[PDB]
Amino acid sequence: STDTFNYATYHTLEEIYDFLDLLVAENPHLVSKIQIGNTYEGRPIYVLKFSTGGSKRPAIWIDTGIHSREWVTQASGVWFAKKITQDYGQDAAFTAILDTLDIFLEIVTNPDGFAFTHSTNRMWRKTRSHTAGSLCIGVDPNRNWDAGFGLSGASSNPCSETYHGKFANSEVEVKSIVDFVKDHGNIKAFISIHSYSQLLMYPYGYKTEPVPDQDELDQLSKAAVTALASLYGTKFNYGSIIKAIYQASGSTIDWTYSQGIKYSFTFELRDTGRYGFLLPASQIIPTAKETWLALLTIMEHTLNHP
Numbered sequence: 319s320t321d322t323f324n325y326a327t328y329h330t331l332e333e334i335y336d337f338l339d340l341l342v343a344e345n346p347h348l349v350s351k352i353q354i355g356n357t358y359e360g361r362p363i364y365v366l367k368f369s370t371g372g373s374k375r376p377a378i379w380i381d382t383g384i385h386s387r388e389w390v391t392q393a394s395g396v397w398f399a400k401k402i403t404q405d406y407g408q409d410a411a412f413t414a415i416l417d418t419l420d421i422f423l424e425i426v427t428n429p430d431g432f433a434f435t436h437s438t439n440r441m442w443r444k445t446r447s448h449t450a451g452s453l454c455i456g457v458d459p460n461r462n463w464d465a466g467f468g469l470s471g472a473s474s475n476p477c478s479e480t481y482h483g484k485f486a487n488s489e490v491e492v493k494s495i496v497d498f499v500k501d502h503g504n505i506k507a508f509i510s511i512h513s514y515s516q517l518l519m520y521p522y523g524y525k526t527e528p529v530p531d532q533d534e535l536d537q538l539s540k541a542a543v544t545a546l547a548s549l550y551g552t553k554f555n556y557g558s559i560i561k562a563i564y565q566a567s568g569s570t571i572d573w574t575y576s577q578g579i580k581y582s583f584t585f586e587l588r589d590t591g592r593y594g595f596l597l598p599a600s601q602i603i604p605t606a607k608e609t610w611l612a613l614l615t616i617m618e619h620t621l622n623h624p
């Protein structure tokens with residue numbers, strides 16, 4: 319059951335999918351699973367919805383595993399799902415969050431990539447869509463969104479790690495999120511989680527110009543990384559994507575923010591390079607724990623600022 323699940327190890331796609339079902343079955347009045355589409359290879363795409371009721375409540379969205387090799391992100395998502403059901407009705411501050419906000423959690427945002435990192439190539443990053451006249455496979459799901467699509471910060475070469483695709487939303491894994499969010503209409507925070515580098519970022523990645531909500535986002539980022547540090551002393555930096563890392567066009571939070579989702583953030587988790595993507599299983603739960611502190615901070619702020 320989810321009480322006997324090993325949270326400190328990396329799992330396969332099937333185990334994570336079995337986990338989703340276990341958690342819904344153990345918490346039928348709190349947690350449900352939504353299929354938002356099928357991947358290029360036909361695998362279902364699922365979102366957990368955590369809700370104490372109401373009808374299209376204001377919601378936080380959290381996604382992990384958009385880039386499939388980023389294993390700590392999926393492993394942390396599993397932990398978060400469990401943390402939510404452990405804490406609701408036990409922790410008062412968290413209970414107050416979920417008595418008002420819904421939470422949507424997409425643990426494996428790129429299932430075909432994820433299965434590929436298990437079957438064939440531990441370092442696979444992209445989707446697994448085939449591109450004609452190319453033998454190279456896949457599109458960078460973090461360059462396929464409709465925000466500066468195709469501008470500097472992405473590549474038109476199908477073989478590139480940052481290939482943008484033929485057009486915005488050409489990847490079904492991306493378009494499925496787009497349609498979910500637009501159909502929902504009441505997403506107030508959108509958090510995309512990646513690794514590694516220990517960063518918390520707000521938009522834009524595609525241009526240098528500051529977002530109009532920059533001072534609010536920046537101070538929230540400061541509050542979040544300070545919360546994160548309070549646990550093991552892990553040091554995160556924060557800023558716009560373009561300043562903290564590099565120019566990237568067609569990325570997720572640029573899109574979400576342009577739809578009016580003000581609290582659009584992207585995390586880069588542990589570590590800063592020693593292990594990079596190959597983070598030991600012994601760092602899964604501390605990464606998750608400290609990251610949960612940062613998440614609490616953003617959620618509470620979203621709760622309090624309509």
Ligand SMILES: CC(=O)N[C@@H](CC(C)C)C(=O)N[C@@H](Cc1ccccc1)P(=O)([O-])C[C@@H](Cc1ccccc1)C(=O)O
Pocket residue numbers: 385443460479480512513514515523559563566569570571584586
């Ligand atoms: C071999 C390697 O490291 N490749 C990079 C991606 C290529 C550009 C070289 C990468 O995979 N970056 C991931 C994490 C990272 C690694 C080293 C330094 C900094 C970051 P990333 O999660 O894939 C970085 C991410 C940044 C981002 C976040 C949100 C909106 C726009 C861009 C991205 O490139 O999508």
Ligand SMILES: [Zn+2]
Pocket residue numbers: 384385388460512513
């Ligand atoms: Zn990434």
